[PDB]
Short mmCIF file of C-alpha atoms in Angstrom, two decimals:
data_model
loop_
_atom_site.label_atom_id
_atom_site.label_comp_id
_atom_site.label_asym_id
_atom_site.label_seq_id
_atom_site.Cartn_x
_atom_site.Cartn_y
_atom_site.Cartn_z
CA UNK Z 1 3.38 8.95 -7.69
CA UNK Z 2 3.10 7.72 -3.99
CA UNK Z 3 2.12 9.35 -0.95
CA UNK Z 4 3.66 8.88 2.19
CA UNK Z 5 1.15 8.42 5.40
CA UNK Z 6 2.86 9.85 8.56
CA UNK Z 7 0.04 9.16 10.74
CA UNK Z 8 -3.04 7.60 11.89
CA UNK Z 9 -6.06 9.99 11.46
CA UNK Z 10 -4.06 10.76 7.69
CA UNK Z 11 -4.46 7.53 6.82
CA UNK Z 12 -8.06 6.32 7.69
CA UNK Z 13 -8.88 9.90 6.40
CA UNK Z 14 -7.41 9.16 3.38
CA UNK Z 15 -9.24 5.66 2.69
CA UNK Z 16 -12.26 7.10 3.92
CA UNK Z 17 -12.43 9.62 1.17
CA UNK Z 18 -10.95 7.61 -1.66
CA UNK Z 19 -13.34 7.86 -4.41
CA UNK Z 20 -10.35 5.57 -6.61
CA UNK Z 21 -8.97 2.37 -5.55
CA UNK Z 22 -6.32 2.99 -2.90
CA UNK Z 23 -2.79 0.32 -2.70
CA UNK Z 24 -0.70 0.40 0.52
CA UNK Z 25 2.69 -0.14 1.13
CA UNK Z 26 3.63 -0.95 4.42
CA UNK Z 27 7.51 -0.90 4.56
CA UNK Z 28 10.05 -0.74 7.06
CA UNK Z 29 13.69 0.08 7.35
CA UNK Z 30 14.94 -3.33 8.57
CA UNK Z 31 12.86 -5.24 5.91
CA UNK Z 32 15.34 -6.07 3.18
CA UNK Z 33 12.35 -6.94 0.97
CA UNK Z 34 10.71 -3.55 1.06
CA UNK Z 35 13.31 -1.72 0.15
CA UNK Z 36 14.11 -3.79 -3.05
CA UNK Z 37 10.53 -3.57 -4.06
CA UNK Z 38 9.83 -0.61 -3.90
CA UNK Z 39 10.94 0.90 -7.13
CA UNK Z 40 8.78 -1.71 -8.52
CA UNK Z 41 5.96 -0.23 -6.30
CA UNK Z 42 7.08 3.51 -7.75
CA UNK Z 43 6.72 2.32 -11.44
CA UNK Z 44 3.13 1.11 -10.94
CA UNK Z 45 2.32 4.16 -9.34
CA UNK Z 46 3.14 6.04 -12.09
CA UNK Z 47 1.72 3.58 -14.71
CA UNK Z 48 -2.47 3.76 -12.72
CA UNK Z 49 -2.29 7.53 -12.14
CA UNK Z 50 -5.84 8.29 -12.90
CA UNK Z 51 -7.61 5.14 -10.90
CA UNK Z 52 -5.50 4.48 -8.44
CA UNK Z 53 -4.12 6.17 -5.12
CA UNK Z 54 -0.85 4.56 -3.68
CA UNK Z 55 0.64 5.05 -0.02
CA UNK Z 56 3.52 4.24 1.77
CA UNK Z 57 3.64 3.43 5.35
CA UNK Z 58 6.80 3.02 7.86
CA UNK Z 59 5.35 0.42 10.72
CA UNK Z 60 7.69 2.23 13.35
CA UNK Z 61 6.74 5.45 12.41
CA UNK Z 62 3.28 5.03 12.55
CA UNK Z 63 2.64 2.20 15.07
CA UNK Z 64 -1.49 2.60 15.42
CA UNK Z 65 -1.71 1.45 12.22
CA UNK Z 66 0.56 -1.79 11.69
CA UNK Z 67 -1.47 -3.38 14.63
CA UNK Z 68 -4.75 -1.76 13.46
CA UNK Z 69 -3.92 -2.76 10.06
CA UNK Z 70 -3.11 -6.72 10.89
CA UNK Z 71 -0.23 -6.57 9.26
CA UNK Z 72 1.40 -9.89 10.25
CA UNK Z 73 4.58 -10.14 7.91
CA UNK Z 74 6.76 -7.66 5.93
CA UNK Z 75 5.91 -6.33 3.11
CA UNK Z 76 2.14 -5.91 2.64
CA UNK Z 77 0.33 -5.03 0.24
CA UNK Z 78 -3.70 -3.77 1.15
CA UNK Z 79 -6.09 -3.32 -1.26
CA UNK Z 80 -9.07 -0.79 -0.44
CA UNK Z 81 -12.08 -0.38 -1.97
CA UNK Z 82 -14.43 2.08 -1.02
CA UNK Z 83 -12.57 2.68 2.14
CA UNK Z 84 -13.11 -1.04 2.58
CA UNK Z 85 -10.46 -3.64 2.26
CA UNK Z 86 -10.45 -5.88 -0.45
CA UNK Z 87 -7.07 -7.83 -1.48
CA UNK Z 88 -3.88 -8.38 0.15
CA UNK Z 89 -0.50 -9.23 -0.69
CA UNK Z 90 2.28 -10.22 1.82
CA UNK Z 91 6.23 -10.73 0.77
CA UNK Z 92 8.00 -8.91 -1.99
CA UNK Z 93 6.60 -10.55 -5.19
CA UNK Z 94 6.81 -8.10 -8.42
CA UNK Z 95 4.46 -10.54 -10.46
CA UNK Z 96 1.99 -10.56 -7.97
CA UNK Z 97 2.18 -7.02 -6.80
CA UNK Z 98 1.51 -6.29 -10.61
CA UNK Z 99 -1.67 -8.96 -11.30
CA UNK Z 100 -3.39 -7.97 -7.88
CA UNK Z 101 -3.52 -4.34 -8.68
CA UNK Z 102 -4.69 -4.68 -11.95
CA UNK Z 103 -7.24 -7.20 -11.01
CA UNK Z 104 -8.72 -4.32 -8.61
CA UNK Z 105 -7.98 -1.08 -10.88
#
């Protein structure tokens, strides 16, 4: 249950209007990590559908927000709130991926 973000605008748009808490992953092609969790990622998507919105986001396809979005190491994990950011999570940790979201769900 995750929805890819393909560009800027989409995105902020998207936390803006979030009425649930929203998880982002920010993944790219060349990052061996990403790719092995992200059916990990899938899974919890599927097990918060009601409270929880999760995204997907390629730094090289959508540049504006990798640098907007301080990411500083791949994977990350952001946490918003209220279209405010509130956790983070950098580095492909399953345990920690699962305890931060349900800390914020």
């Amino acid at each position: 249950m995750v929805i890819q973000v393909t560009n800027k605008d989409e995105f902020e748009s998207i936390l803006s209007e979030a009425d649930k808490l929203v998880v982002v992953d920010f993944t790219a092609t060349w990052c061996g990590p990403c790719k092995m969790i992200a059916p990990k990622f899938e899974e919890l998507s599927e097990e918060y559908p009601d409270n929880v919105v999760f995204l997907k986001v390629d730094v090289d396809e959508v540049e504006d927000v990798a640098a907007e979005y301080g990411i500083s190491a791949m994977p990350t994990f952001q946490f918003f709130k209220n279209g405010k950011k509130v956790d983070e999570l950098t580095g492909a940790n399953q345990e920690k991926l699962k305890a931060m979201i349900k800390k914020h769900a």
